[PDB]
Amino acid sequence: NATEIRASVGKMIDGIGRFYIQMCTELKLSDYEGRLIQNSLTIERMVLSAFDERRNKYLEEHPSAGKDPKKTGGPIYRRVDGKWRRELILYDKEEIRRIWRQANNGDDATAGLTHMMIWHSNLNDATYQRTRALVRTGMDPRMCSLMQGSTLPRRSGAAGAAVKGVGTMVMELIRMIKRGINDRNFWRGENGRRTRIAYERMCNILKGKFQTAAQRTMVDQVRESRNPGNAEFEDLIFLARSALILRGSVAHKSCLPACVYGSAVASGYDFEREGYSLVGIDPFRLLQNSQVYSLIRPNENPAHKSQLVWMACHSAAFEDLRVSSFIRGTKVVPRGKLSTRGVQIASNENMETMESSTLELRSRYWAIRTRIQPTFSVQANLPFDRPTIMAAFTGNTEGRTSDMRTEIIRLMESARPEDVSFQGRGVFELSDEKATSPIVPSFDMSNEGSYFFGDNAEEYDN
Ligand SMILES: [K+]
């Protein structure tokens, strides 16, 4: 089966690569410019757009370049006369779709679109705080670590779901409910058994991430409300709190930008023939041989920009910094400590003071995602820091109450020498491709374990 799965995924990767190579030819990019990560973004967003049908399935459109709905594109950056120059290209969505399909042996390769969509999601996860979204949902900002895939477009399911975290689901459910509290037949008619079927589906997706019968059970109690309101809200928030301790099973998917794949395909790599898996050496191998540049703002530290992108590539934001640091071979610091802002350049920034720099995306070691395999690894889910504890164990002194609420607290209060939902990394030498010798990591215990400690990133909604 993996016999043909590695092929199937490989096949996808070829397609993104070929697509990218061709888009580079189209736009007449210099080798450097094609390796410019902000150009990679614009090109990815382009193809995503061309297939979105304005559904917000694959992306959210600004619309900072597209009033004419038949057309799509964004800022492309070229090096001219010792200056970085930004131009907005517009293309026919039809034309893009053409090129995309052509790069995919004539297929629709929806998996490729999704792969790019997740890469963006991962990049946003590494970059932007969601503190504001959480309060407006009545959640606790210390739940920031449950907010995987929080930034995925409002329509997706096929593969979108697996990467969303427990908080993201709670937030999405709460948002629905909250709007059944300004009613207007939100729950009656065609519409309100339409949404009622959505709501059901979501609760199930939620339920699935949960890894104890107590919490799943409690989820069912919420699903099978009927006019959902403040009652369920409370239970959900209760549920999110429990997810800080009895954590959910959430897929972390390591998806690289299109330029990396493009470059590998131009280097004659045959992904379909060789196979591809997101879960082990494959993305590490690619990143070791890659050459990606980035635009850089004055007073930003190239190394920090580098961290930001590495993290995103390896989908590592909600993972223990100490593990990341160990695999990278240089300290992976919390976002608050990072002398950089996001990879994308707001259209009002700038170009006069802009520079480019080389991204450092290598790693000292490589790793297999465990419990996806299960040898000797170490927990790569976040540590129990004070603030996680404090947010996990509150308003139960209060209000609502149940046998489901009492179990759960019970499980929480006693929560193991090891811990439920084991997201791992097994770590190997790059000189040990076949994985013959697990390295037992030695963490530096003085490092902060949470990407989100002292966070100060721009808030995502802006
Ligand atoms: K910062």
Residue numbers in the entry: 21 to 391, 408 to 498
Mind quoting what the paper says about this structure?
We then crystallised the obligate monomeric R416A mutant of NP. Crystals with space group C2221 diffracted to 2.7 Å. Even though the crystals of wt and mutant NP have the same space group, wt NP crystallises as a trimer whereas mutant NP crystallised as a monomer but with 3 molecules in the asymmetric unit; the cell dimensions are different and the positions of the monomers are different from those of the protomers in the trimer. Most of the mutant protein structure is identical to that of the wt, from residue 22 to 385, the rmsd is 1.09 Å for 364 aligned Cα's. From residue 386 onward the structure is different because the exchange domain folds into the groove of its own protomer rather than in the groove of a neighbouring protomer. In the monomeric mutant protein, residues 386–390 form a β-strand (β7) and residues 392–407 form a flexible loop that points towards the RNA binding surface. For trimeric H1N1 the last visible C-terminal residue is 489 and for H5N1 this is residue 496 and in both structures the C-termini point away from the RNA binding surface. However, in the structure of R416A, the chain is visible until the penultimate residue and points into the RNA binding surface, reducing the space for RNA binding and changing the electrostatic characteristics of this surface (compare figures 3C, F and I, blue is positively charged). In the R416A structure, E339 makes hydrogen bonds with R461 and the mutated R416A points towards R461; if the wt monomer structure were the same as the R416A structure there could be a clash between arginines 416 and 461. Therefore, the R416A mutation may both stabilise the monomer and destabilise the trimer. The structure of the monomer can perhaps best be described as self-inhibited in which the exchange domain that is involved in trimer formation takes up equivalent positions on its own core rather than on the core of a neighbouring protomer.
The template for transcription is a complex between the viral RNA and the nucleoprotein (NP) that binds to the RNA sugar-phosphate backbone. NP is necessary for RNA elongation by the polymerase. The formation of such complexes results from two coupled activities of the nucleoproteins: RNA binding and self polymerisation. The nucleoproteins of influenza A H1N1 and H5N1 crystallised as trimers and NP of influenza B virus as a tetramer.
